[PDB]
């Protein structure tokens, strides 16, 4: 499977799709989220009646924040990947002011919203989601991609209750070490905080944080200020809730391992150390991939998304930052 997937990915990676729609082809309905250099809107493609999520990036804001290369990485990778638990990019294009990525709409909202409301997920519920992340990272890492943005805010729940990973803004295709300080404080591996060259093992550490947060209802390292979070991470002293199973604690001690020669996902057996762990004994990896497992939770409707202030989309009469985004 992975061999065929790499062939498919490389053809798209080497020859990326460009300019596959236009802003006038979509009716903009409502804002689903906002970020430093734009917003995500629910849109309707008038030709088909399909709903999509449109990520709008202001070129000038990307340039001001020195995020050009990361924005080019995001679109180049997202247009090339194909996996059941990844958001599907349908179109991309740009105009004088903005870049646009149009993705299949995932109506269930963020895992973040459901997790905070419910409090915590039971171990079988958390295991169901964690299995999907394990398979997704096995897929991404096999293509030499590092994701670097795992958190419940970036995991969307589809109509079948399965996950769709979004936000490839920090994704990068890299064969060696990399050094960028990026991610979310609670999810940073110690080697990122300590300004070391790091690798895909940072995604496995982030999975450890995610599983802990899903099962506990709070992350393993938190504090009001990021500097305080970093001190807790680099110490790596993790305390587990009394309701955590012995198998769950063993798995987390292996993922939330400061020692790279000991961290699960980063050993000679790679992902198999995770797949074969006792916590995952009840997991049928193939049925998860095939979406045959009954989901523990089933969510143009935007009710599973928070409300955001609307703003008119202004397109300048002059092209901005043309050379910087020529390949988009």
């Amino acid at each position: 499977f992975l061999a065929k997937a790499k062939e498919d990915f490389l053809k798209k990676w080497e020859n990326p799709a460009q300019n596959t729609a236009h802003l006038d082809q979509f009716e903009r309905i409502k804002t689903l989220g906002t970020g430093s250099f734009g917003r995500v809107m629910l849109v309707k493609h008038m030709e088909t009646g399909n709903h999509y999520a449109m990520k709008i990036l202001d070129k000038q804001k990307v340039v001001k924040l020195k995020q050009i290369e990361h924005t080019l990485n995001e679109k180049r990778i997202l247009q090339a990947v194909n996996f059941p638990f990844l958001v599907k990019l349908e179109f991309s294009f740009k105009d004088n002011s903005n870049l646009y990525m149009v993705m299949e709409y995932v109506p269930g909202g963020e895992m973040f919203s459901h997790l905070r409301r419910i409090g915590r997920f039971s171990e079988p519920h958390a295991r169901f989601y964690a299995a999907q992340i394990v398979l997704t990272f096995e897929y991404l890492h096999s293509l030499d991609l590092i994701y670097r943005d795992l958190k419940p805010e970036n995991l969307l729940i589809d109509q079948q209750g399965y996950i769709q990973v979004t936000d490839f803004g920090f994704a990068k295709r890299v064969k060696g070490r990399t050094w960028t300080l990026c991610g979310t404080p609670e999810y940073l591996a110690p080697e990122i905080i300590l300004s070391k060259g790091y690798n895909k093992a940072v995604d496995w550490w982030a999975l450890g944080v995610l599983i802990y947060e899903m099962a506990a209802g709070y992350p393993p390292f938190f504090a009001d200020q990021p500097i305080q979070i970093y001190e807790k991470i680099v110490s790596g002293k993790v305390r587990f809730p009394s309701h955590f199973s012995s198998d769950l604690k063993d798995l987390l001690r292996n993922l939330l391992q400061v020692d790279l020669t000991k961290r699960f996902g980063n050993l000679k057996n790679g992902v198999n150390d995770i797949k074969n762990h006792k916590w995952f004994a009840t997991t049928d990896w193939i049925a998860i991939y095939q979406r045959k497992v009954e989901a523990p939770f089933i969510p143009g409707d935007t009710s599973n998304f928070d409300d955001y202030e609307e703003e008119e989309i202004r397109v300048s009469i002059n092209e901005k930052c043309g050379k910087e985004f020529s390949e988009f």
Binding site: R116, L181, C182, G183, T184, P185, Y218, A223, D224
Partner: peptide
């Protein structure tokens, strides 16, 4: 409790990237 400490913290909302 750790849960009460989390809920009273300023980090329960959507977390921004660094």
């Amino acid at each position: 409790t750790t849960y009460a400490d989390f809920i009273a913290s300023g980090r329960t909302g959507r977390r921004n990237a660094i």
